[PDB]
């Protein structure tokens, strides 16, 4: 098999898993929108490549970044291009290759807004500048996401507020877990693309096991969370990049939790992770299996 196994993430950061993809060249030109169905229309993604690269030739390999926005590119576990960051980038790093001979390639990407593209190309003494070509790229095996803990959960109902203070609602749906990093982006296209925006989710938590759980709030910058109609974390003015727990609860499998979480961005960037720890249980998203609107 040619090309790179690419792993599709719905936030800015490598984080919430939606799509793995065999592609064949890294030769992408996205624009404003997603690169797949798969992946919100928000204008907030990333992906990891990975894989193999062949050379054809003994000699010093210069490697071609074009980027909007951020790359890393490691060839041979080396990192030679290191330009994570909001700019736009038309970067080349340099690696002594030995014809024939197989090395790892992993290149991480992200869009934080606006236009997305990236584009690999090679060059050496032998070889004419040119999109590294699907015939030197072997795809690595696909990585495993997802949590193990079973439930016929869908997620948790949201509304997207166009206003900081939940108010101006926009849209309205489903959303599988709260694990969210939009950058300086929007939850939605149909959000205003000024970082003052806000949402509320609602519904119940079911619980998979008899035991003590804690509940994490990751926020950037501010969020309240309620459970069963308590107020157990009040941060909404808290405007900082923080976390926030709840006390141990004692909880039953099959129990139903009430959630409402409200989050806010008030200015720069936006993110905000719902998580849990439970018995057999470490610190992790609560999973789309235990979340239900209703
Ligand atoms: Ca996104
Ligand atoms: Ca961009
Ligand atoms: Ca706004
Ligand atoms: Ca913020």
């Known amino acids: 098999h040619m090309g790179l196994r690419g792993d ?17 060249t890294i030769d992408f030109f996205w624009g404003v929108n ?14 990891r490549w990975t894989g193999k ?19 890393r590119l490691w060839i041979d576990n080396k990192l030679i291009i290191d330009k994570w960051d ?8 340099k690696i002594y290759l030995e014809a024939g001979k197989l090395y790892d390639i992993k290149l991480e990407y992200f869009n934080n807004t606006g236009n997305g593209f990236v584009k690999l190309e090679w060059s050496s003494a032998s070889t004419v500048r040119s999109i590294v070509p699907t015939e030197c790229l072997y795809p690595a095996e696909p990585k495993h996401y997802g949590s193990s803990i079973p439930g016929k959960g869908i997620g948790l109902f949201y509304e997207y507020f166009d206003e900081d203070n939940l108010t101006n609602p926009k849209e309205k749906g489903i959303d599988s877990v709260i694990d969210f990093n939009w950058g300086v982006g929007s939850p939605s296209k149909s959000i205003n693309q000024d970082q003052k925006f806000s949402v509320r989710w609602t519904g119940f938590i079911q619980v998979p096991y008899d035991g003590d759980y804690v509940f994490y709030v990751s926020y950037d910058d501010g969020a309240s969370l309620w459970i069963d109609r308590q107020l157990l974390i009040d941060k909404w003015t808290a405007s900082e990049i923080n976390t926030a727990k709840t006390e ?3 909880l039953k499998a099959g129990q139903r939790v009430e959630v409402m979480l409200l989050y806010r961005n008030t200015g720069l960037a936006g993110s905000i992770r719902l ?13 789309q299996s235990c979340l239900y609107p209703r």
């Open 8 to 24: 599709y993430f719905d936030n800015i950061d490598l984080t919430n898993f939606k799509l793995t993809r065999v592609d064949k």
């Open 34 to 47: 997603s690169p797949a169905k798969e992946i919100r229309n928000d204008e907030s993604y990333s992906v």
């Open 53 to 71: 690269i062949r050379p054809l030739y003994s000699e010093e390999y210069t490697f071609y970044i074009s980027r909007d926005n951020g790359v």
């Open 86 to 93: 909001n700019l736009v980038g038309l970067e080349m790093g």
């Open 248 to 250: 141990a609860i004692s």
């Open 275 to 287: 998580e849990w720890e439970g018995p057999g249980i470490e610190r992790s998203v609560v999973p």
